[PDB]
């Protein structure tokens, strides 16, 4: 589209990513997982 390339679910309307486990990924030595930081980026800014 306009304003940058985008992803859209094929042949459906509401794609659902069902993440199985959230406690289980790995901290670094400060306390911040890159996974939960990435999903924070997505659920706040709708992109990456």
């Amino acid at each position: 589209t306009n304003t940058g390339r985008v992803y859209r679910p094929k042949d459906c309307e509401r794609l659902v990513l069902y993440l199985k486990d959230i406690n289980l990924p790995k901290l670094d030595k400060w306390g911040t997982s890159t996974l939960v930081a990435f999903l924070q980026q997505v659920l706040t800014y709708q992109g990456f």
């Binding site: 094929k10 042949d11 459906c12």
Partner: protein, 1056 residues
């Protein structure tokens, strides 16, 4: 069936035809010069209609198949099928609910991805069909006639067990006699049946419709046989009284002819016992005179309303003429008693005390099996049919088959069906081709021995050789089961119940000098049959009995005239390959006379000279098409010699010729009266018979004929729907269809699909399946049963597709060196020549396609230089690849458009013509062209190399161009070698340059001796281009279609 509720769709054609109108309207907008500013909206509507068409054309499939497959899985629920069909049910009803919500037609373009939903529903329905195969074979073993219905209609009749539209649409193909039925006032019973012309016979009792389909089809079979049986008894019971039971509305012709023959038989066997009795001969003469007199009471009204069955009279005259000849020969020999074999030679139709017929020849007897035939064309009793009938009846007495044979075009195929008509059986004419499975022949045999029908296996010769060997064991098993009066035979494992009134015959030709590819039959297999000679029929007897039957009075003179015309015209006129004077041309001319006398009594009055004047036009509606010029003139001179002053009358109609000249005027051709004559001629032939050959050389105007008659007819006539095959490009099993060998699954083909599409269409259509390709017998003989007097196309599975009175096949071709004369005598013909073509009439339209900046000089130079240089090249004839005239013309012309002056036009003419010669003649071609031009160049030595420049007006200097860019880095690739520009390479490039530019899209082929410089120079000319994409494919002795198709499809888009 289960009480659900649903909304459904109808009136599809109303929606689809608007879409087709809109797409062709967009194509009409694509020709406007202002399309460049409005292209972008056209792209929208293009893609929109392209989606919507496929969506509708899938949804109608899904609707029809869902309606079919609801009741079957509803009634006999097996859950492994039920889960499948429930998922398909959910996926369909979910779409149809959203259509019930919004019914705007462009919502299907904007639903939630329906494309994969539709394709998956179609695929799952295909899979539940493959699950239903086993149940289909169960019901085919249940009711015997179903082996010739396809699956596609059989599951309809199983499902739609109450729908009247289904019954009237598919009961015709089951019982061949009944064309349609009626219904009572609540659609719960069937009370009557129809015919093709509308002969109506009521049933003696109503027929209860129900769900279990065999439990009322059995009722149809029994109640039809009982109805005809009681109707025959009632007719004969009134007829053996003293007064006549003449009331031809009250009975079908099948009972009239039979009652007259039975009463004739019993009266003559009283006669020869009592007395010679010329009284009975006089009685038959006066009775025949009475019928011919009453025939003039229906002929003058003709087309009335609720009055037909003049045909019941004409189907009675012939039997009366047969009885006349029998009594006259019994008078000529003066037979004493009944046991004298000159009476028992003649065919006898007795009555049994159980009131049913028993057809009895010499000692063998059979039974009448009450098949309702309706109106059909019977035959004239020539004395060859005596031979045929006695051989076949003695062979059936000995428990064997019958194999009539002889040359092409006699009557052996229809003689078997005529015997089946006179006996009361049903006949299922087949075709035998392609080498089908012995199990595939086995199931056909199972159907024939369960029903009780005569397989008339037409073309049993051309069949694969070992299949004949296994079939021999099969036939021997069946004939043993017949001769020992067995009730239970056994082939292919099962205990198939064989019928006592069964029978098998074949028909074939001997594999003579020109009957194509046919394999010789085994000796064992020949020992099972009984051969009959059917070589020569008569020609005077048939032609006089037909004309005397068809109301014409003077048959005894004119029939001999016809036969003498046939014999002289076949005998003295020059023997071309493609002529014919068989029995089929005669049978055509007789109906061509019957139609004209059918018009000229209900439309006027009758008199003397017109009755012998008609037959000249009714003969020249056929015979004029075949001829050349001079042979047609000599044929006219022969027509003058047989008929002294009754010479000529021309084409009656002209209002179609106005539209034809209109359509020529539209498409910017020229207007030639010869093309007009040939097109009107083609319309005559297409009205006359089933198939037309258009013989002609290359490019000489034999496809534009039908191409323009299409539009010229379609402007007034209904619909001309064209389907175009080319039968040699694709393989055989895709063309005619074939069977998967292990699965036993009928794959469809191209023209089987086209035949289904044409028999779908309503009665106000016309369609021309066109096979624009060359002719081999081993496929074109597969259409003998279509191009027959019968009209039927057969699958190797046993499925048989009829045709109505609409369809024509048009066969554009090159020559008929390789076609057997069965097909040549089978279909109509149009001839063309190399004398009728007008070269100037094709030069003028090409000149009319010129942009008006050079046309003065071009016409002034063509009109005095072109014809000499063309005729000199046709005089030399040393040209290396063989072309026709049209080809030489186009090779001359396509190197011209854009000449400036005279001296340039000379050289363009030389490069146009002399490319096809060789070097022994090209030099003196150049010598005569420059000498009979203005002047000579300074290229007097080797004049093949004249370089006309536009810049100075230079004529000729051959100069060598030496490169100076030479390292070893050029030679790095083995290809892309540095081309040294020698004068011959410059001549090649000067040849190539006019045709590879972006204004002349021309295909062309170089000729060179092997290893000479073709590929290098053509790659150089590829490299001179601008925005091309070269894709070289090396062909060899194995290269087929799919190899070039994938070499294309690797580097080519697919846009819809």
């Amino acid at each position: 069936s289960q009480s659900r509720t649903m909304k459904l769709i109808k009136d599809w054609k109303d929606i689809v035809n608007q879409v087709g109108d809109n797409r062709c309207l967009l194509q009409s907008l694509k020709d406007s010069p202002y399309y460049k500013g409005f292209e972008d909206k056209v792209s929208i509507w293009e893609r929109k209609l392209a989606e919507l068409d496929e969506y509708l054309q899938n949804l109608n499939h899904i609707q029809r198949k869902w309606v079919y497959l609801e009741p079957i899985f509803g009634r006999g629920a097996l859950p492994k099928e039920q889960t499948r069909f429930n998922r398909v049910d959910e996926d369909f009803r979910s779409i149809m609910t959203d259509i019930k919500k919004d019914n705007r037609v462009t919502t299907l373009t904007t639903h939630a991805g329906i494309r994969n939903s539709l394709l998956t529903i179609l695929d799952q329905l295909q899979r539940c069909q493959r699950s239903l195969n086993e149940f289909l074979e169960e019901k085919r073993s249940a009711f015997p006639r179903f082996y010739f219905i396809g699956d596609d209609d059989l599951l309809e009749i199983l499902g739609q067990s109450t729908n009247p539209s289904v019954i009237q649409s598919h009961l015709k193909k089951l019982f061949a006699g009944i064309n349609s039925v009626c219904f009572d006032e609540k659609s719960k019973h069937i009370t009557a049946m129809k015919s093709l012309e509308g002969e109506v016979v009521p049933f003696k009792n109503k027929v209860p419709l129900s769900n279990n389909v065999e439990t009322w089809l059995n009722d149809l079979a029994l109640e039809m046989k009982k109805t005809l049986e009681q109707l025959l008894k009632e007719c004969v019971t009134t007829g053996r009284s003293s007064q006549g039971a003449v009331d031809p509305s009250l009975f079908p012709s099948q009972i009239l002819c039979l009652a007259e023959q039975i009463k004739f038989t019993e009266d003559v066997e009283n006669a020869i016992k009592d007395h010679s009795l010329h009284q009975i001969e006089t009685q038959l003469v006066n009775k025949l005179e009475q019928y011919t007199n009453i025939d003039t009471s229906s002929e003058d009204p003709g087309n009335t309303e609720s009055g037909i069955l003049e045909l019941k009279l004409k189907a009675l005259i012939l039997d009366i003429i047969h009885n006349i000849d029998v009594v006259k020969q019994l008078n000529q020999i003066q037979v004493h008693t009944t046991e004298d074999w000159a009476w028992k030679k003649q065919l006898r139709f007795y009555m049994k005390s159980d009131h049913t017929c028993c057809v009895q020849m010499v000692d063998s007897e059979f039974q009448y099996t009450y098949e309702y035939q309706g109106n059909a064309s019977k035959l004239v009793y020539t004395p060859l049919t005596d031979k045929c009938y006695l051989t076949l009846t003695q062979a059936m007495k000995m428990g064997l088959g019958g194999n009539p044979y002889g040359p092409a075009g006699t009557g052996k195929t229809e003689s078997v069906k005529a015997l089946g008509g006179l006996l009361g059986r049903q006949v299922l004419v087949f075709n035998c081709d392609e080498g089908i499975d012995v199990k595939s022949m086995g199931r056909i045999f199972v159907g024939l021995v369960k029903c009780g029908a005569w397989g008339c296996f037409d073309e049993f010769n051309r069949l694969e050789e070992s299949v004949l060997s296994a079939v021999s064991m099969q036939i021997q098993t069946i004939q043993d089961a017949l001769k020992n009066h067995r009730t239970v035979c056994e082939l292919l494992g099962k205990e198939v119940e064989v019928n006592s009134n069964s029978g098998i015959f074949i028909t074939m030709n001997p594999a003579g000098k020109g009957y194509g590819g046919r394999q010789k039959l085994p000796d064992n297999l020949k020992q099972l049959f009984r051969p009959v000679a059917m070589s020569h029929p008569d020609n005077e007897l048939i032609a006089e009995v037909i004309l005397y039957s068809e109301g014409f009075k003077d048959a005894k003179v004119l029939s001999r005239k016809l036969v003498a015309i046939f014999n002289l015209s076949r005998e003295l006129l020059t023997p071309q390959q493609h002529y014919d004077w068989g029995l089929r041309a005669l049978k055509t001319v007789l109906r061509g006379s019957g139609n004209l006398l059918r018009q000229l009594n209900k439309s006027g009055t009758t008199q003397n000279a017109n009755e012998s004047h008609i037959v000249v036009q009714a003969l020249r509606l056929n015979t004029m098409s075949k001829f050349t010029f001079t042979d047609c003139t000599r044929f006219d001179a022969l027509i003058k010699d047989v008929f002294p002053g009754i010479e000529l009358k021309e084409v009656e109609y002209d209002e179609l010729s106005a539209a034809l000249k209109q359509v020529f005027e539209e498409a910017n051709y020229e207007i030639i009266p010869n093309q007009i004559k040939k097109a009107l001629e083609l319309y005559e032939q297409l009205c006359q018979r089933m198939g037309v050959v258009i013989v002609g050389p290359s490019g000489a105007g034999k496809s534009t004929l039908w191409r323009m008659l299409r539009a010229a007819l379609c402007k007034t006539g209904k619909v001309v729907k064209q389907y175009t095959m080319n039968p040699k490009a694709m393989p055989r099993y895709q063309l005619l269809g074939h069977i998967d060998m292990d699965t036993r699954e009928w794959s469809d083909g191209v023209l089987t699909n086209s035949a289904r599409q044409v028999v779908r269409e309503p009665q106000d259509v016309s369609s021309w399946i066109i096979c624009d390709g060359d002719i081999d017998p081993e496929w074109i003989e597969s259409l003998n049963s279509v191009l027959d007097d019968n009209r039927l196309l057969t699958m190797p599975s046993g499925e048989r597709i009829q045709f109505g009175p609409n369809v024509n096949f048009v066969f554009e071709t090159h020559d008929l060196s390789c076609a057997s004369p069965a097909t040549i005598s089978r279909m109509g013909m149009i001839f063309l020549s190399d004398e009728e073509t007008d070269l100037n009439s094709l030069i003028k339209s090409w000149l009319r396609n010129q942009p008006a900046e050079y046309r003065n000089n071009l016409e002034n130079w063509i009109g005095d230089y072109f014809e000499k240089a063309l005729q000199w090249v046709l005089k030399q004839n040393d040209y290396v690849v063989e072309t026709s005239l049209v080809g030489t013309v186009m090779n001359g012309l396509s190197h011209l458009h854009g000449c400036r002056d005279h001296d340039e036009f000379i050289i363009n003419l030389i490069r146009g013509l002399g490319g096809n010669l060789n070097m022994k003649s090209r030099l003196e071609f150049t010598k005569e062209v420059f000498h009979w031009a203005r002047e000579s160049p300074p290229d007097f030595h080797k004049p093949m190399d004249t370089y006309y420049d536009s810049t100075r007006g230079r004529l000729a200097t051959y100069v060598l161009k030496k490169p100076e860019d030479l390292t070893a880095d050029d030679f790095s690739n083995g290809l892309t070698l540095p081309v040294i520009q020698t004068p011959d390479m410059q001549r090649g490039l000067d040849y190539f340059k006019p045709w590879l530019s972006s204004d002349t899209k021309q295909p062309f082929i170089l000729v060179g001796p092997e290893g000479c410089g073709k590929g290098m120079l053509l790659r150089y000319a590829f490299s001179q281009l601008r925005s091309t994409q070269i894709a070289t494919v090396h062909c060899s002795a194995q290269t087929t279609s799919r190899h070039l198709l994938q070499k294309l499809s690797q580097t080519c888009m697919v846009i819809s």
